[PDB]
């Protein structure tokens, strides 16, 4: 849709100004180190000459600790065991990957723990057997309440000599929550407790992973055919290179920048070049994007290697435009689970526009409720619900026949590109601010929106959305690809 | 004469922590009175507004609520809350013991 030079002029800007803004940030922590230091105590390290890791990240330092301890352990066990069956005999598999998840789960949690999945399991399992959604949907519910309970989490705590195995166990059932949920709601010889059982301890997904849907795992796991060991070993090869690259970046990216350090003390953050400001979000929203193609790709590829089909992985959230095509593809598992359930049982978009309104509300409610319902999330969440319905809306507008026979009549299709990328700069503008809200708290996000909108008005804001619109320019020529099927 | 509360975490980084002081008057449920976020912002309860002043000091890892013009009402007991604020930070949440506040 556009002459070769156009689009080749855009992404040189785009990535001319990301590694522009990556410099501004590196400098700026390069400034800071012994401040920095003193404060939120950067860990060391020779995996990069001297340079001096930043661990302020939770969920980053919290994994790689534990799959040094026991995780990537269990997981080669649970490679080894999967082939084993699939060798010796196929037609058991299901209840010895059940039985080694089991085995895993009582590792790392021990019975206080595994008692408390089987619990859960098991009550949603008998409100299931009364076959009725509001009723599972309450339980699962209740059960992440609880998991949210003060008193609840003071009985656990006494539990765990070190507090890492209580947070383990904590994401740990927040899945559970979904993957039982997901069952309870498909029962609302394919479904009996042996089954439940199976799916819910499925090692590969268990602490944190893809949510992998009901119907998949029964289908594949039951089914009679597999490819041959030397192409399981290739496949396994090849993914476990690609980890590794993932892992390596991940790392340059929290050694080089000190991104976590520069959010958590504020008053860092509301005296720095806007240059910075730009480079920090990016740079945060690209090592999330990172930190969950990481922790995703070890489940995608023991799932794989086991025959089963995940959802696929994140796509760099550098050519994501929209809330929308990001709420499609980043969170593939997620996606699809909010859209089968959650949305269409309260009425969709199939039912007024009020319909499509209070389906996404719920939704969107529903999806800040589950990563734990603090002010930060109700407000990513918020954030997004207006985003995405303002988007739709748009949308529906434009499909209108006297809307598009309009704009073919004045615009050439030449220019109308020029107007998607331009209502996707706004767009965008406002995808990174809800994700920087998600990520830094409340307080990044005004300092954001103080320093570049309303303190920044006159020219700082035409820059960014300019800045912007070339992102939006290449992000839109490249999802023009997979988007339109 | 005016009574000062502390809140001295320890073991913990505390740069980042949004401290909170919840009051529990008897047979009534836990409210919040004063919020001091990692920026600096403050926030008050509407009853205590004024009155209140709360404090933190990052280099020694300690709050301060600082109540003046007491009144028989504010009798209850006091919960420090440390909660972070942000994905990058986590799920952090570290209720305090709490203490007993006791006029007329």
């Known amino acids: 849709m556009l002459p070769r030079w156009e689009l080749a002029l855009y992404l040189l800007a785009s990535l001319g100004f990301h590694f522009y803004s990556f410099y501004e940030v590196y400098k700026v922590s390069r400034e800071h180190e012994e401040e920095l230091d003193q404060e939120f105590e950067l860990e060391t390290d020779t995996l990069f000459g001297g340079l001096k890791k930043d661990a302020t990240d939770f969920e980053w330092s919290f994994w790689m600790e534990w799959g040094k301890q026991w995780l990537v352990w269990l997981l080669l066990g649970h490679m080894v065991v999967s082939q084993m069956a699939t060798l010796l005999a196929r037609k058991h598999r299901p209840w010895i990957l059940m039985l080694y998840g089991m085995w895993a789960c009582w590792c790392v949690l021990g019975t206080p723990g595994v008692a408390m999945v089987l619990l859960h399991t098991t009550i949603s399992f008998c409100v299931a057997q009364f076959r009725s959604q509001l009723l599972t949907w309450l339980c699962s519910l209740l059960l992440l309440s609880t998991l949210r309970l003060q008193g609840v989490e003071e009985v656990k705590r006494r539990w765990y000599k070190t507090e890492n195995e209580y947070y383990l166990l904590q994401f740990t059932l927040t899945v559970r929550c979904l993957y039982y949920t997901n069952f309870s709601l498909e029962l609302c010889t394919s479904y009996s407790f042996p089954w439940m059982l199976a799916y819910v301890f499925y090692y590969p997904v268990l602490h944190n992973g893809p949510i992998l849907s009901f119907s998949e795992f029964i289908k594949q796991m039951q089914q009679q055919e597999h490819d041959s060991l030397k192409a399981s070993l290739c496949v396994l090869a090849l993914g476990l290179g690609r980890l590794l690259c993932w892992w390596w970046l991940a790392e340059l990216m929290a050694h080089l920048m000190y991104m976590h350090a520069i959010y958590s003390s504020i008053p860092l953050l509301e005296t720095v070049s806007c240059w910075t400001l730009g480079g920090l979000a990016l740079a945060q929203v690209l090592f999330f994007y990172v930190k969950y193609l990481v922790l995703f790709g070890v489940p995608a590829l023991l799932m794989r290697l086991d025959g089963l089909t995940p959802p696929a992985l994140p796509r760099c959230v550098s050519t994501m435009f929209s809330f929308t095509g990001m709420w499609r593809y980043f969170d593939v598992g997620l996606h699809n689970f909010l859209i089968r359930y959650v949305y269409i049982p309260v009425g969709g978009s199939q039912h007024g526009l009020l319909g499509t309104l209070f389906s996404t509300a719920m939704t969107f409610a529903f999806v800040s409720y589950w990563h734990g319902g603090y002010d930060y999330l109700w407000c990513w969440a918020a954030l997004n619900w207006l985003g995405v319905t303002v988007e739709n809306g748009v949308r529906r507008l434009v499909e209108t026949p006297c809307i598009q026979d309009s704009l073919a009549r004045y615009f050439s299709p030449q220019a109308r590109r020029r107007f998607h990328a331009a209502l996707a700069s706004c767009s965008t503008s406002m995808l990174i601010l809800s994700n920087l809200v998600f990520l830094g708290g409340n307080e990044v996000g005004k300092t954001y929106w103080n320093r570049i909108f309303i303190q920044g008005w006159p020219w700082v804001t035409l820059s960014v959305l300019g800045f912007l619109y070339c992102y939006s320019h290449v992000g839109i020529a490249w999802a023009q690809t997979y988007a339109t099927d | 004469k005016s009574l000062r509360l502390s809140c001295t975490a320890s073991?913990?980084?505390?740069?980042?922590?949004?401290v909170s002081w919840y009051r529990q008057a008897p047979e009534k449920p836990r409210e919040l009175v004063a919020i001091?976020?990692?920026?600096?912002?403050?926030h008050y309860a509407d009853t205590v507004k004024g009155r209140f002043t709360i404090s933190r000091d990052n280099a020694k890892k300690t709050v301060n609520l600082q109540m003046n013009s007491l009144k028989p009402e504010d009798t209850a007991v006091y919960y420090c809350?440390?909660?972070?604020?942000?994905?990058?930070?986590?799920?952090?949440?570290?209720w305090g013991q709490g203490t007993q506040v006791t006029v007329s």
């Open positions: 809350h440390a909660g972070v604020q942000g994905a990058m930070l986590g799920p952090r949440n570290y």
């Open positions: 073991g913990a980084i505390f740069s980042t922590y949004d």
């Open positions: 001091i976020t990692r920026g600096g912002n403050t």
